[PDB]
């Protein structure tokens, strides 16, 4: 039926309805530190989030998205391996049922407890809908989450979850500052890929930060109390909403640091 992360409609089944699943530039992939090419020409990243306007938070089955007003250049991504301005539209997480799993990308086969995806679209295309038809339409800033000390900036997201427990719920989520979710350093790995959920369109330039952010056990625990199901249906806990790594094929992972 509609895809999911279940035994019967999971990642291994995705190819039946989305043929692109066995494509050439699918994501996520495993980051092998000893094979990534140090590309000195890669420019530094430019993250401008001071005029960011968060609007809503919703549980769409699969995961929960915090949406941003992208009608103007309020929160943008420039620099690095990118050419042109990219507007932040939404961010979401992928997590597991246990701390030792949850991330989509792995570093040398190592899984993190979760992974934050900050989704941006290429402004030259006009709207996100057009962006997804171009090979360089999207830019997703990936940030790993490891369990340790609590991340203050993540607390606002954690407290509102009780109100979007099931599929289809949403709640006003204004004045959220995404800068509170960035680590100290902006060192990154970059490679050409795709969305990690159906439609699995190969329209993404991936930028994975080297430094992970740390969150408390109680913070990620509250993520795990969300539901895949809508109100009134049997309860199915929202966990392990991650796609396993894919073959790199004819692709090069470039590092911005030595
Ligand atoms: N985990 S990830 O960063 O790769 C990712 C980011 C965004 C989306 C998304 O916006 N879905 C909607 C959507 C995307 C399309 F490409 C076409 C239609 C559509 F509704 C999906 C996956
Ligand atoms: Hg595309
Ligand atoms: Zn994602």
From Swiss-Prot:
CDD domains to which the protein is assigned, alphabetical: alpha_CA_I_II_III_XIII
Cofactor(s) this protein requires: Zn(2+); Co(2+)
EC number: 4.2.1.1, 4.2.1.69
Effect the entry attributes to changing residue 117 to E: Strongly reduced activity
Activity control, per UniProt: Activated by X-ray, histamine, L-adrenaline, L- and D-phenylalanine, L- and D-histidine, L-His-OMe and beta-Ala-His (carnosine).
Pfam families in UniProt: Carb_anhydrase
Entry keyword annotation includes tRNA-binding: no
Entry keyword annotation includes Cell membrane: yes
Sequence positions bearing Phosphoserine: 163, 170
Mutagenesis or variant effect for residue 63 to S: 2-fold decrease in enzyme efficiency, as determined by kcat/KM ratio, and efficiently inhibited by chlorzolamide
Site-annotated residues for Involved in the binding of some activators, including histamine and L-histidine: 90
Mutation effect (residue 62 to W): Impaired activity, rescued by 4-methylimidazole (4-MI). Impaired activity, not rescued by 4-methylimidazole (4-MI)
Illness the protein is tied to: Osteopetrosis, autosomal recessive 3: A rare genetic disease characterized by abnormally dense bone, due to defective resorption of immature bone. Osteopetrosis occurs in two forms: a severe autosomal recessive form occurring in utero, infancy, or childhood, and a benign autosomal dominant form occurring in adolescence or adulthood. Recessive osteopetrosis commonly manifests in early infancy with macrocephaly, feeding difficulties, evolving blindness and deafness, bone marrow failure, severe anemia, and hepatosplenomegaly.
Annotated family: Belongs to the alpha-carbonic anhydrase family.
Name listed for the protein in its UniProt record: Carbonic anhydrase 2
């Amino acid at each position: 039926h509609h895809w999911g992360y279940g035994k019967h409609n999971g990642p291994e089944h995705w190819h039946k309805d989305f043929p692109i699943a066995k494509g050439e530039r699918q994501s996520p992939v495993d980051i092998d530190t000893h094979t990534a090419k140090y590309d000195p020409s890669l420019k530094p990243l430019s993250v401008s989030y001071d005029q960011a306007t968060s609007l809503r938070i919703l549980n769409n089955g699969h995961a929960f998205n915090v949406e941003f007003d992208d009608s103007q250049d309020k929160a943008v991504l420039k620099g690095g391996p990118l050419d042109g301005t990219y507007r932040l539209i939404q961010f979401h997480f992928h997590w597991g049922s246990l701390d030792g799993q949850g991330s989509e990308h792995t570093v040398d086969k190592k899984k993190y407890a979760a992974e934050l995806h900050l989704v941006h679209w290429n402004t030259k295309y006009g709207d996100v809908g057009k962006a997804v038809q171009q090979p360089d339409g999207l830019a997703v800033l990936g940030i790993f989450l490891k369990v340790g000390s609590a991340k203050p900036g993540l607390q606002k997201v954690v407290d509102v979850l009780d109100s979007i427990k099931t599929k289809g719920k949403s709640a006003d989520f204004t004045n959220f500052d995404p800068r509170g979710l960035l680590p100290e350093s902006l060192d990154y790995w970059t490679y050409p890929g795709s969305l990690t959920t159906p439609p699995l369109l190969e329209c993404v330039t991936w930028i994975v930060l080297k430094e992970p952010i740390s969150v408390s056990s109680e913070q990620v625990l509250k993520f795990r109390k969300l539901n895949f199901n809508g109100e009134g249906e049997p309860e199915e806990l929202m966990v392990d909403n991650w796609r396993p790594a894919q073959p790199l094929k004819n692709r090069q992972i470039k590092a911005s640091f030595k």
